[PDB]
Symmetry: C6
Subunit: 219 residues, 6 copies
């Protein structure tokens, strides 16, 4: 990653063993549960494209997902190249060349180049641009791997309402519902998919009930 | 988080893998036991709003609680916006814009903006303001999840008085009794809910007994 | 805690995840065995009152003990307020107010105030004063929780003398015997509570025997 | 490894216990699965040739592979010596001698020499040159140890298409297919090796389907 | 402990959680096996008397040994006081008082005093003096706890000579044989206590055989 | 160990708990497998003679080996004293005395002396000299403890050739074959000790086959 030293410089630092192991272990333990993605983002704080590639290449399983992710990266790289074409001439001696999409993805750029871009005044933030592409790809993977439609999350007859709500919102998160839909669902599908005893209570409450008020009402 | 370097500057530092894992693991192990909240506060020392969001987004389960927490945050953000409306014009070039409630919550502000606010002279402490909102929400969750009323904590016939007191005060803490009530309960409900043999001894002690004196009296 | 940086300043540093976890884990594993107290003292090196509260609030069990500890803290705070009353007027602008007992205990003081006191020239050592109150309370807890009187530690007929001595001194430590009594007990209760075969040997040794000499004599 | 200190110098630092243990443990757990190689590269960031030798020499098993790796290193060293012959005379006093292939591999060079080369202006990057040789050797080992031809990865009759794709791409990676072949295989061998029910669906899709589109189609 | 900072000063640093836990865990796992003592010495590098007391007070078991250790410390303190009596008058204002034996042992001295002594030019090395007393006491404990006389270590009829030698030298170490005796024992008790078949071979070797030569001879 | 600080000084630093535990644990887990030796060398990077003694003294088992190692150290110390005799007069006041072999081994030298030698301009590298003696001794131990002659490593009838090669080269390493012999053995004993089916294939290959080519040929 790129860090600041005591002279007030952003400098390169090697990726740590603790970071490397943390990422490998959360993929092994959680696969593509939605919470793996904010974990990835946080573990890759300050990452260069080289570091992001390291993290993704250290994953042993899930090679269908990794191939899909490469396809998404290649799509975003091709859109970058449409928006930001580069000169096809020799580099000005000593000077900084403009990144192509494959330079952002770290496949055609060196670490030294990446450091040069990221520590330019002002930064050409290749690590943050690449991370955005990766996260777009990982969100597609999370949705693909989501096992259950929200339509199929219904409260059991003896299931605590809290347990059902947990299953409902875990499914909405994996299915990639917007925050707008999550906030709105409280007055609609959440009640519909409730068991008859709870449904009666929630129907009786009237409109505008907070989730807290619905959860208190059904115990 | 924001830290001080050797030039006497508060600087940004990436959230550590140890911090990330510590938080995920205490939620997995303790859920919304009351002691998880001071743990959250301590693990989030110096946090930016981005860091606070990372910590909350890394939680995989408990999605009913996480949705309730988002509702509480949105309430406090709307109260901030009532108290501190911002100008709806273009930013003065190079200058610092005033935060709205969604900027404090990190959903409409960048990390660079958050750093600017938190390291202004004097600080606009967006991380501490947001943390206060989060803790308000988490305390509501702890009370919701508290399984047992204090009325239902009564000493068993062969239960050591110490074990009963432990159960009593654990329940009072989850039910969110004030320190005033915790301090006062020693002369009242604690004795009432004691077993007959202890109740006799504690009744005999007279008023003003310290909890230490009650615990010594009943063994 | 408060630490020294490279400009020779004592600065605030966040409590570490390793410190937080170490304390929670020693309470879970050892409860109020006497050795938990020097552990607390060492883990809280440099602590502010805020840090001390964090450590105590992160404890999930043992809520009878935690309530007793709050009572002891409130006693010592009331004695501080008797000895060191503060002015009941507006603060001199920009200047440092004198701490009350609840400021020392971190309930009515901010972190910034605590830093101001602890880094004043010369320090008003609020963290060390509060730690002294806490340790006084924890020692009361250790004595309360000590399961066995020294009178009841007697060597078994086939118990190795070393094993008995270990049980004797572990009990003396939890019962909070002074070092004077620990040093003196070697010539008296330790021998009396020995089994007949050892008692004969130790009686034969004469007075002034070191514990080493008694332990060698009985094997 | 070589790191930068606060005077802006790249300095030597000892290899850490965490790095040493991380490498030993990933070889013990993963052997020569393909993902062990990007792990090696990342754990050896900034390594001197001495550090690279340490890492390889700390491996206890897999001595057939380690002997093969020595053979590959000796081949690349002999090619370096063909391209970059050195003077066979006495060193200019105080001056830096040119590295031979065995100096790059750390067998005939001292640590001080390696530091001199790597911190020259501009660097003679002996650690990076040697790491390239090692990685070439490790990739040969990964291919040798790959257990299964791609021809033999075929979807079972009740095997989820995702599980099959995972097995297909894991095998392609170990067999060291180019990214070109991985990207192209989606329209050809992947479909051929699918079960009849999926094969029908994928045949029906038409050409140019993304892997995401094929995986969605077959569930 | 006392450490050097970047201004070239030895400064106080808090004892780490890793150090605290390392010591507690080696006593739990090894008790007073001889190798616990060099571990203690290394974990207490740079320790103040306060730190040494912390380490010893964090031990929960082994209270017979801890009482014996206090007795040894009190003996060495009384010898220090015989050799180095201090003035029984008021301290020169602002000036450094001379340590008594109980000041070296940290029972009558403050941390600030200990820092003053240890960072004086030249140091009054109270931590190293106290550590020497502690190690003298711990060596007495190791000998007391040694279970077996060297006379009773004899090679079994089917015991590999190496296994016997290991048992012999482990016992010599716990019994606190000098290095002179360890070096000499190879020509004498080691052979005598060997089984008849080995004894014959070692007798046949002649005098002056290295332990390596004896171990090779008997397999 | 000795490290460089920010003023560009090599300074003493305490041995870490992680280093101490790493060494104890690799001896417990691997005993004198050959890979323990490069581990020792790497864990002792920058070590003083005091640190090297700490590491060796922290080993609890294997006391036959530790006594053999002391004998080897004493041999190398006596050779140093033959080559580098020292003056038998009083030290020049304030000046640096020349090390004897027992000073290099840390038995007759203080830490301060060792620091003085190792940080002299130019260094008298006592830690590196002593480490060389220790490694010479440890290599003798590894050979002594090697359980099996290379003559006795022969491929089983159903043993994969790779598994056999692994056993062959693990044995050659413990028996301390030179790299020359390891490289040459591929054309000779490795083939001879192969099973008949592999032997036929390897015989058919002709001379000069790489180990990779032999391993591919036999599967
Ligand atoms: O075709 C490619 C090659 N890429 C690659 O191998 O990057 C590392 C990576 C990326 C995604 C998954 C696993 C590892 C970059 C993007 N596109
Ligand atoms: O609607 C919203 C969106 N928020 C959000 O997603 O923040 C992170 C978070 C917050 C609470 C729980 C889990 C994660 C911010 C507040 N309100
Ligand atoms: O009534 C009070 C409130 N206190 C409090 O809550 O402090 C933290 C704490 C203290 C003791 C035990 C558990 C946590 C401070 C002292 N007295
Ligand atoms: O013959 C050699 C000797 N080498 C060697 O021993 O290096 C360390 C190493 C290298 C590969 C595998 C295990 C350990 C360097 C290259 N060629
Ligand atoms: O009587 C005393 C009191 N001492 C003491 O308590 O020190 C800490 C310690 C020392 C030895 C064992 C356990 C803990 C110092 C020496 N003599
Ligand atoms: O006789 C000696 C004494 N030595 C010694 O005790 O050093 C530490 C050590 C060395 C080897 C094995 C275990 C511990 C130094 C060398 N010769």
């Amino acid at each position: 990653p790129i860090v600041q030293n005591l002279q007030g410089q952003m400098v390169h630092q090697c990726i740590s063993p603790r970071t490397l192991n943390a990422w490998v272990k959360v993929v092994e333990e959680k696969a593509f549960s939605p919470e793996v993605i904010p974990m990835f983002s946080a573990l890759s704080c300050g990452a260069t494209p080289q570091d992001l590639n390291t993290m993704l290449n250290t994953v042993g399983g899930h090679q269908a997902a990794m191939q899909m992710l490469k396809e998404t990266i290649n799509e975003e790289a091709a859109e970058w190249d449409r928006l930001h074409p580069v000169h096809a001439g020799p580099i000005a001696p000593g000077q900084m060349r403009e990144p192509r999409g494959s330079d952002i993805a770290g496949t055609t750029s060196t670490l030294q180049e990446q450091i040069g871009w990221m520590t330019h005044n002002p930064p050409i933030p290749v690590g943050e641009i690449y991370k955005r592409w990766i996260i777009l790809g990982l969100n597609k993977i999370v949705r693909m791997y989501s096992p259950t439609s929200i339509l199929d999350i219904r409260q059991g007859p003896k299931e605590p309402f809290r347990d059902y709500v947990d299953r409902f919102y875990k499914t909405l998160r994996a299915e990639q519902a917007s925050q707008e839909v999550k906030n709105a669902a409280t007055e609609t599908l959440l009640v519909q998919n409730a068991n008859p005893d709870c449904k009666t209570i929630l129907k009786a409450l009237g409109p505008g009930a907070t989730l807290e008020e619905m959860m208190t009402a059904c115990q």
